[PDB]
Amino acid sequence: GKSHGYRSRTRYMFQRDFRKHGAVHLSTYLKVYKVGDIVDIKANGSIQKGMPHKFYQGKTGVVYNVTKSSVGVIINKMVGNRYLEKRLNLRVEHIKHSKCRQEFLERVKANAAKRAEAKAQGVAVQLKRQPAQPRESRIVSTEGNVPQTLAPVPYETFI
Amino acid sequence: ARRPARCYRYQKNKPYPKSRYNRAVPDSKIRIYDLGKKKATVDEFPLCVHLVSNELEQLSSEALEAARICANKYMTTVSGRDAFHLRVRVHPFHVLRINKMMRGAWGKPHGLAARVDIGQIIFSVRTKDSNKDVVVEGLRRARYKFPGQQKIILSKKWGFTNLDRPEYLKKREAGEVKDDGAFVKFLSKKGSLENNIREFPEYF
Amino acid sequence: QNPMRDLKIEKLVLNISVGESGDRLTRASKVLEQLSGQTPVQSKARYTVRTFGIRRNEKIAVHVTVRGPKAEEILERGLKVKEYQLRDRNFSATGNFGFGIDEHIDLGIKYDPSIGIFGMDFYVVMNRPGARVTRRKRCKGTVGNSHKTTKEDTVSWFKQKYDADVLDK
Amino acid sequence: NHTAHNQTRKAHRNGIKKPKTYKYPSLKGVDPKFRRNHKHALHGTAKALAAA
Amino acid sequence: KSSAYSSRFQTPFRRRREGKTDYYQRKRLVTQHKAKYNTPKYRLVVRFTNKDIICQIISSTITGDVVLAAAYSHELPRYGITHGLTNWAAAYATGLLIARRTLQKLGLDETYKGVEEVEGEYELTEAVEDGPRPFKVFLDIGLQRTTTGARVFGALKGASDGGLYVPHSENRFPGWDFETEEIDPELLRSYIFGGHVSQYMEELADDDEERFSELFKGYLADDIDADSLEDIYTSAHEAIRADPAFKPTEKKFTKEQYAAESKKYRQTK
RNA sequence: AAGCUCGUAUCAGUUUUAUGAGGUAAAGCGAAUGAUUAGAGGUUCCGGGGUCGAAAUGACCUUGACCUAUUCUCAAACUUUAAAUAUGUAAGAAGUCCUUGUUACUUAAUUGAACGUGGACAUUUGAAUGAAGAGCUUUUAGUGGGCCAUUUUUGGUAAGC
RNA sequence: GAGAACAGAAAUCUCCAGUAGAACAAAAGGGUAAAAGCCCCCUUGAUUUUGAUUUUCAGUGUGAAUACAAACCAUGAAAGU
RNA sequence: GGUUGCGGCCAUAUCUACCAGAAAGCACCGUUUCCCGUCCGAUCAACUGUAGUUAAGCUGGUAAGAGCCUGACCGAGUAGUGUAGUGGGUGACCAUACGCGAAACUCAGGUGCUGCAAUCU
């Protein structure tokens, strides 16, 4: 019959990256974790004790607990027509901080500092981001780069 | 019993080769893939005539056999066995299933097949420039056997090599080339100097 | 030339294989005590076959390792048992060698009646000083190609010492 | 036998609702070792702010 | 070897190739209870080279370890020891030294004095009543094999008698009886001072006189007989209480003259 | 259907920026694991023959394996690598900084941790578009035989299967 | 692979290479090299109290697991487990 | 700059073949009275650094080296792919429009950087 286990369809998923087998580098057990932090999940099949389910591979969540050798994360999961909160307890080898926030907080520092700067300067500033606006006008030289005329090339003599 | 080949022509299913999962498979009818003066150097036969496909189909191991036979029975009988070198590129690894009987509609293997794509060599014949009128006809009598539109091509490469005629002559005039049984060994401009000079002493 | 480059010996192994177990092995073990002063160690079997009739975990062979000048002494009194004649085939790749003998009283032991006659294998190994690094726990490492014993160095040392007869056949 | 056509449409009709996260979430799965001290800390803070 | 072997080889870590560490043990020492969020985890690192002892107080961070304080056997002449620098005695002395150094580099040298009169007893450093707690460090013996009588548990003993609370159990100090599972403190106190060296010296001094000097060629310089070692090592133990602080050497050069010579020996490309 | 609390919040079958996961197509197999054609350069005290031979750990043909660099062609249950589409999360007011009160947890510790007070920042309140209003609860009807198409695709020779 | 009397394709012994090509009770996959494999020493965390959580899942059960708290214990020099 | 102890990133560090290495340092090398451990003071434990030495180890160089890393006017905007058409084609397949966009080959370059403490002509 059909089998629906706890690690089914995890052949290419939980096997270590090529040429990265063996002990885990110690900077996994030294990146400290607090509550409110935001983390991603990537599971390594060398540490069988403390694994997530395969659904929580590649996901992202927020921390709500801290204990020895492990933490706990909140993750919202889709089922049917609503999102359920999942409070799951993982070890730290299966965890990496998410840089989506560590790149946001520096922008917080920057726009706060320049709001403190313009407030000392006497200028009203913009600090909302903006997308890539279109390109502006310009004058393009022909002093060294004369246009090289082109034509397509036939089939014969290539074959 | 056999099916008609107009049933297993197109690439419908995904390949089902021979392995521990599919162990007992009847063996092919084609076993030879090389004919002519096999043990002949690249210097003797410069010219290479291919037989390319124009569609995406399946080729049968008995079709390849009966095409090779009717292409080798002509060249060998009109020019001579030691006039050419004939190489079958593709190999039949795909397997074909038959429902010799729908409760348990799985099929037992009885044949093999070769997968081809849009642009793919099958036959490659190596000869001199004074035997192409025979080679072209010997492949014309072969394109009749297995199905589809198959166009014969006169290459720019020297033999079964990758270099064109004058580039290969540029390489031969120096010591950048050494011969093998029927192939070649180009001299790299990188590697261990001592081993590079041991072989190819005519250079430098 | 160089101190700490001579091909000093380190140990010698007196292996004996019998093929079966019982009082035979104990009479093979009450013989090397006087010849070494140290107890042997009874080696246990490995596989099964009917020809030799052995099974796993069975003791059929016995050996002892010996170091210091005692191996030198025993080899000096056991090579004139061979008339100092050794063959080039007895020299391995890494420059250690050995040889068999049949009469284990040819060394001159006070003959024990209750043991009889059974032979004795020898295999001596040497190494220039500084080979600890292949054994120690902290900072392991191999030794260079300029510090490895071979047939060439060993036959030189074995012609210089023992005063002749290495049969280079 | 498991024709799952028209399930996502049914889902998206009445909407896929987020769980409406709150302030001061539940402390059920947290370390009791920390829970007890947090409890005993808040009472002291209340006593310190009643006089003040 | 071929290319398929190298292209699918995996290099172990640098220090596991060099053989100088054990990561299976480092993962047990360095890591900490996460509710103890950013606090350190202090190790008493101790290493015995061929002719010198290293002791260190080591914390662990991401971009390498951090040394709080460290001691080496080659400064004990500042207190009076001049020979037998790789010894159980020198280990105890260096442990007392590093302990008395750190316990004033932090500012606890008064509250936790340790034991001022050793008698060779297994005694763990208690905490004071309603005060600061002892400095809690741990221990990691390299790649060494623990065996009872080792030079390193002398350092452990000197540490715990200094005051910095290294948890241990007596069954690897010498004088511990495997039979009755008890300890003899007097043998241990003998090994603190010269008990496995003084006895050997005064044995050979009437068994084999010439060889005694061939080995102990240095103990006849200042006329050290095989009985003064007790008053020597206890004077060391007391001077270490007197002035445990580190005071570095005076350099004949200034780190550029040193480099200028090696820059014309290092064999650049 | 009944409504209840509220009034543009903060939500959205959507994009962008930033940041993560996959092992499908493709590609590779002179890279691992298997399958596979070809001759060449080699090696034997050791697969078998023939010859010289008393015989050789002896010589020459010969043929397969092992050795070496090469070559033709493949893998849904092989893979170093690795897309497209789709997918997880963040883009602030429940925020940032400063000051420092509580505790039976934690620290070598007046140590950090969690929650806090009082100050400053509150205007472009920190990407785009739009918002026919957002949130919440009760109760119950019918259904719980499905089918067709483009693309992917498994059995099947194939089907209005 | 090269070596040692009886000894061979093979019993026991020694040296070099050896990224796992070994073994891990059991199908397959994953994982593991001063180990999760081999040998040895000590052992009963194969224990009590109820809870929280993940998986199939209506977010009911059952089964199997994960991380903690209060106890008692082993083991280890120790962190730890 | 050299070196030791502890290390972080884990081949730009590895692998093979040679060569050189003042200073101290590391290392090898000396002995088994003691705790201890071995069939074997070989390993391991302890003792002296006292007796000897860079030959190893170790570090640094060299190789049109193997391997690995980086990079593009190499291949390639190719193969593949989301969308579209009363587009073509008997069909298989294919072409075009809007968009995204690899890998292998090839070529060129690189061959450990660094963190705390201590020490060195």
Residue numbers in the entry:
A (entry chain T): 2 to 160
B (entry chain q): 2 to 102, 115 to 217
C (entry chain E): 6 to 174
D (entry chain a): 6 to 57
E (entry chain P): 8 to 276
Give sentences from the paper.
Following their assembly in the nucleus, pre-60S ribosomal subunits are exported to the cytoplasm where they are converted to translation-competent particles. Analysis by single-particle cryo-EM with extensive 3D classification yielded a series of structures (hereafter termed states I-VI) that likely reflect sequential snapshots of final cytoplasmic pre-60S maturation. Sequential maturation of the cytoplasmic pre-60S subunit couples dramatic conformational rearrangements of two long flexible helices (the L1 stalk and H38) to recruitment of the final ribosomal proteins (eL40 and uL16) and assembly factor displacement. In conclusion, we have used single-particle cryo-EM to demonstrate the conformational changes during cytoplasmic 60S subunit maturation that couple incorporation of the ribosomal proteins eL40 and uL16 to the release of Nmd3 in what is likely to be a universal mechanism in eukaryotes.
Rearrangement of H38 to the mature position (state IV) is followed by partial (state V) then full (state VI) retraction of the L1 stalk. In turn, the docking of uL16 to the upper surface of H89 promotes a dramatic ~65° rotation of H38 away from Nmd3, sandwiching uL16 in a cleft between H38 and H89. While the initial docking of uL16 to the upper surface of H89 is still compatible with the retention of Nmd3 on the particle, it promotes a ~ 65° rotation of H38 away from Nmd3 to adopt its mature conformation, thereby sandwiching uL16 in the cleft formed by H38 and H89. The initial docking of uL16 is fully compatible with retention of Nmd3 on the pre-60S particle. However, in states I-IV the eL22-like domain of Nmd3 extends into the PTC where it is surrounded by helices H64, H69-71, H80, H90 and H92-93. Furthermore, the β4–5 loop of Nmd3 stabilises the ‘closed’ conformation of base A2971 through specific interactions with the side chains of K204 (helix α2), K224, F242 (strand β5), Y240 and the backbone amide of S238 (β4–5 loop). As a result, the uL16 P-site loop is unable to extend into the PTC in state IV because of a steric clash with the Nmd3 β4–5 hairpin loop.
